[PDB]
Amino acid sequence: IVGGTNSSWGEWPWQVSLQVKLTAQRHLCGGSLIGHQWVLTAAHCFDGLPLQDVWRIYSGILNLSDITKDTPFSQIKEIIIHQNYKVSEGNHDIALIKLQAPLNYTEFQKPISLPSKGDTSTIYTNCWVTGWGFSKEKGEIQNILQKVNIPLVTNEECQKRYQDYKITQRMVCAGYKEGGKDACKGDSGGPLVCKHNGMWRLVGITSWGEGCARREQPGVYTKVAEYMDWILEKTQSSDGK
Numbered sequence: 001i002v003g004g005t006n007s008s009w010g011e012w013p014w015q016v017s018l019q020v021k022l023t024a025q026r027h028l029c030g031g032s033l034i035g036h037q038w039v040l041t042a043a044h045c046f047d048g049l050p051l052q053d054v055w056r057i058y059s060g061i062l063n064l065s066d067i068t069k070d071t072p073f074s075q076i077k078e079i080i081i082h083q084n085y086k087v088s089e090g091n092h093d094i095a096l097i098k099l100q101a102p103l104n105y106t107e108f109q110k111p112i113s114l115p116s117k118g119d120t121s122t123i124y125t126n127c128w129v130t131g132w133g134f135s136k137e138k139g140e141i142q143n144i145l146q147k148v149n150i151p152l153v154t155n156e157e158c159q160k161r162y163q164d165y166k167i168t169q170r171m172v173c174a175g176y177k178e179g180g181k182d183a184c185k186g187d188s189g190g191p192l193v194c195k196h197n198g199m200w201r202l203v204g205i206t207s208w209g210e211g212c213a214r215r216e217q218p219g220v221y222t223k224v225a226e227y228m229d230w231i232l233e234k235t236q237s238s239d240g241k
């Protein structure tokens with residue numbers, strides 16, 4: 001998070017940390033808890049890595065340096081990457097992670113409400129992006145969970161900023177003309193939440209940007225509302241009703 005501030009215990013209780021355990025354990029991505037057994041994250045977090053054994057999910061945590069071998073974590077039972085996602089490309093950057101065990105809800109560990117498919121037409125006004133990513137371009141992983149207030153930009157206004165790519169109706173962009181406030185590497189897969197009608201809703205999944213916080217270069221997010229039919233279909237038990 002570039003241009004952000006420290007967050008408090010219980011402020012973003014849905015935020016999780018996706019870490020890989022290879023030669024050393026490192027935070028790679030953010031994610032949002034959406035159910036007792038489900039986390040929503042970006043498909044690009046899994047590029048060049050197996051879906052099995054190497055992942056650990058941390059929830060109910062504010063500072064990354066507090067994580068030791070004693071800290072309880074969630075393991076992956078299944079990873080569902082969008083069928084149309086292509087490794088190293090931008091479209092459909094979304095994945096669901098099914099946990100091996102359900103997580104009990106506390107005031108520090110609870111899900112973020114999902115929008116409806118019809119909520120695509122809604123223009124939000126109080127949006128925040130959180131994570132432990134780089135505090136500046138080419139920077140380093142932050143210890144304390146950062147937060148930042150970022151306004152949304154129209155898809156047409158976002159398309160003009162990225163004329164070498166195609167900003168689809170399945171993406172939502174957020175930034176300031178002067179830059180200085182944006183998500184960065186390590187924030188990927190985390191939440192872009194908006195407060196609407198008194199309650200918090202998951203609007204975007206942090207995906208990409210040309211660098212971080214550059215002027216007139218807004219952050220691109222996977223628009224959750226455009227994937228609600230997919231999330232609902234994929235979270236069904238598999239064994240059937």
Ligand SMILES: *[C@@H]1O[C@H](CO)[C@@H](O)[C@H](O)[C@H]1NC(C)=O
Pocket residue numbers: 004005006144
């Ligand atoms: C975040 O917390 C620590 C001290 O607890 C320190 O890095 C800094 O004072 C805090 N950040 C800001 C922007 O105050």
